[model samples]
Target: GPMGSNAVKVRHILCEKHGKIMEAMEKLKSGMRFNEVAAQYSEDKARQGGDLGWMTRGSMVGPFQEAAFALPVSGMDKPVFTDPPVKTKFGYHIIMVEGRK
Candidate 1:
């Protein structure tokens, strides 16, 4: 099965609604910055613009790690909404694959 990690805390939380998730992603693609949005909407201010640092495979939760590495590059894209929304102890997420440095 798949696995994930919370190496990075989710800062920005876009609309929980699926349709809104797409809209938020459009905003990001159209020049919305990651840290800016993260700070603006994140529930956790500390990790809002902070980096998740690094981790090996399986270091994070299954869904989280799977989604983290799923991004095409190391930058923000539209929110990738997970059904049941990638639930964990933290909360549901509308993930933005920030990047892998």
Candidate 2:
């Protein structure tokens, strides 16, 4: 029920290559936990799990920010993610939204 309204709490798993990103997506979709998924597949230098505590406005890449902002917030044991994955100049982003403001 929360939509960020220009701010959000999120994290992600990024892959420079499509193969691994897609694999990671399927892994999460198959019921794997987000923490473990990031621990294994996320390639960014941020927190191992890529915890983006809170973000406001559009301070990230175009596709990344747009997709992250569009997905639903964390709710009912289902934390929304970027489906079909998100493509940006950096690579493929597996956005996992947690909180909204």
Candidate 3:
């Protein structure tokens, strides 16, 4: 039960909008394949299809982390496409949330 137990399947939401705000919200809801999305969209090969890794409470930004913690198991949120696309000073982002450990 390797896949059934160990690895957590998740998705990454990428947008050219505000930055990463709305994109993050979309990922929390839709469990998408990162690599596929990345390969198709990401300019950085390193970012495509890689696990975002597990994160504990208070590990991420206030807004991003808070959203993840709020959702129930196997839940999905609405797709957030920021006009400027959610910005985080780090630049634009396409947020995606995988299941927790």
Candidate 4:
């Protein structure tokens, strides 16, 4: 039921393997930067730094869109990081809510 009317900006690290995605999460918790991890691990080079930019409800697949829009981000300046990584058709994603409008 989660959906967004306004566009949302996000960055994500996608991995084919669940374990690998968990490793990425661990690295993140240990202080590794988001962009750095994405660049190093993402399968898609274009999304390497994982800047997906502006997206609205239904723009992405069901699970991904739901998880992305459900993220807590009341303040625009602060990026909200998803604790449990999101799973989708492509793979697992570690999402960061960058902005919304």
Report, for every candidate in turn, its global Cα lDDT versus the true structure: 0.50, 0.79, 0.43, 0.75
Residue lDDT tens for model 4, 21-72: 8988887777777787778777653355777888887787777777877886
**Candidate 2 — what's its lDDT?**
0.79
Predicted structure with the largest TM-score when compared to the true one: 2
Cα deviation of 45, candidate 4, in Å: 4.9
Which ten residues in a row are the worst by lDDT in model 4?
72-81
| Candidate no. 4 TM-score | 0.81
Predicted candidate 1 versus true structure: per-residue lDDT over 5-101, tens digit per residue: 3344333443435555455455555677666655544444425452345655767566666765665444554444333345445544445554443
What is the model-wide C-alpha lDDT for candidate 3?
0.43
True-structure Cα RMSD, model 2: 3.7
Clashing pairs in 1: 3-62, 4-60, 4-61, 4-62, 4-65, 5-60, 5-61, 5-65, 74-99
lDDT of 2 by residue, 18-91 (tens): 99999999889888877678878988834557786788766678788888778888742576788888999888
Better of 1 and 3 by lDDT: 1
Error of 4 at 12 (Å): 0.3
What are the clash counts of all predictions, listed in order? Answer: 9, 0, 19, 0
Worst 10 residues of 2 by lDDT: 1-10
Model 1, C-alpha of 98: deviation from truth (Å): 5.3
**TM-score, every prediction:** 0.51, 0.85, 0.43, 0.81
